[PDB]
Each structure stands twice: as structure tokens, then as C-alpha cells.
Amino acid sequence: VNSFSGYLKLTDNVYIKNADIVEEAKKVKPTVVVNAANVYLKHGGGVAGALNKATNNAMQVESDDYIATNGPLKVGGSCVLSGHNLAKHCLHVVGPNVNKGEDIQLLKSAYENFNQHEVLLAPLLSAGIFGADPIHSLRVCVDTVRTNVYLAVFDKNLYDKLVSSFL
Numbered sequence: 123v124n125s126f127s128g129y130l131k132l133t134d135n136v137y138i139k140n141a142d143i144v145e146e147a148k149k150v151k152p153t154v155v156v157n158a159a160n161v162y163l164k165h166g167g168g169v170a171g172a173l174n175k176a177t178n179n180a181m182q183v184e185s186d187d188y189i190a191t192n193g194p195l196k197v198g199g200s201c202v203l204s205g206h207n208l209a210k211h212c213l214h215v216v217g218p219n220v221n222k223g224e225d226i227q228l229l230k231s232a233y234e235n236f237n238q239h240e241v242l243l244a245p246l247l248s249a250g251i252f253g254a255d256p257i258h259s260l261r262v263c264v265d266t267v268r269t270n271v272y273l274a275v276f277d278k279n280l281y282d283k284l285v286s287s288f289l
């Protein structure tokens with residue numbers, strides 16, 4: 123039993139809700155919140171911009187030190203950093219950005235990072251400003267993630283469309 127509330131159950135391990143991931147994180151304080159990161163950890167917009175703003179830029183400060191030491195992530199890769207005031211940890215995961223010409227097959231590799239954590243709050247990788255089809259993102263998620271994932275879907279029309287089209 124966990125403290126996630128109001129989610130629709132899609133499969134044995136995948137749950138979904140229309141929610142602002144920032145407000146969800148602030149309520150639940152999950153062990154892991156997933157960020158829709160880029161390889162440079164520059165949290166300018168989308169989910170990443172929102173989560174960073176909610177940390178008063180502390181996420182960006184920590185991220186800049188991470189990059190200075192380790193260099194950029196790989197597309198499809200991840201790193202674990204602090205969750206600041208939002209969660210215990212933040213798993214920064216880089217899904218392919220279609221608006222950069224990045225390979226969509228890497229989306230499965232991106233979701234594989236979730237399997238290293240028993241429970242996560244997360245957005246749909248590569249959706250929104252990353253330019254991929256959110257219906258496809260949800261499908262790859264369901265077919266790749268085996269741990270317990272609670273998906274927060276921002277757009278209402280996106281959420282109802284995601285539920286009504288789910289196979």
C-alpha cells in the first residue's frame with residue numbers, strides 16, 4: 123500500500139492520472155520523481171522547467187555541478203540526484219526529443235531506467251515539448267516498465283484521449 127490517490131489502474135503495475143506532476147510530488151513526497159531531462163540537465167521548459175522552478179532553482183544548481191563533473195547524459199540514459207522539496211530522489215531520464223531528430227527507438231531504453239526503482243511518479247517520456255506521440259509513450263511504458271509507475275498526465279484532452287484509446 124502507498125499514498126498515491128485517484129489513479130486509474132491500467133495494468134498490474136501502471137497507473138495514470140490527470141495531474142500536475144509538481145503538485146502531485148508536493149503532496150505525496152514520493153521516493154522517486156522522474157524528470158523529463160535533457161543530456162545537459164538544462165531544466166528550461168516542460169516538466170523539467172516546472173520541477174526546477176518548484177525547487178527554487180536548487181535542482182538546476184545541483185545539476186550544473188553534476189554535469190561539470192560527469193559530462194552529459196546519453197539519450198536513453200539517466201542519473202539519480204536529489205528530489206529537493208519534491209521527493210527523496212529525482213531520476214533524471216532522457217527520452218529522445220523528436221524536435222531534435224533523435225531516434226524514437228531510444229524511448230524503450232529510456233523507460234528501462236525506471237526498472238531500477240520499485241515505485242516512481244513520472245511523466246510520459248518524450249511527450250509534450252519532446253515531440254513524440256503520447257499514446258505511443260504510454261504503450262512503450264506499459265510494455266517496458268515492470269516496477270510500479272504512477273503516471274501524471276498534464277493535458278486533460280491528452281488524459282481522456284490516453285484512457286479511451288488504451289488497449
Ligand SMILES: OC[C@@H]1CC2(CCOCC2)CN1c1ncnc2[nH]ccc12
Nearest residue numbers: 142143169172245246249250251274276
Ligand atoms: O507527462 C508528460 C506531459 C507532456 C506535456 C507536454 C505536451 O502535452 C502537454 C503536457 C508536459 N508534461 C507534464 N506532465 C505532468 N506534469 C507536468 N507538469 C508540467 C509539465 C507536465
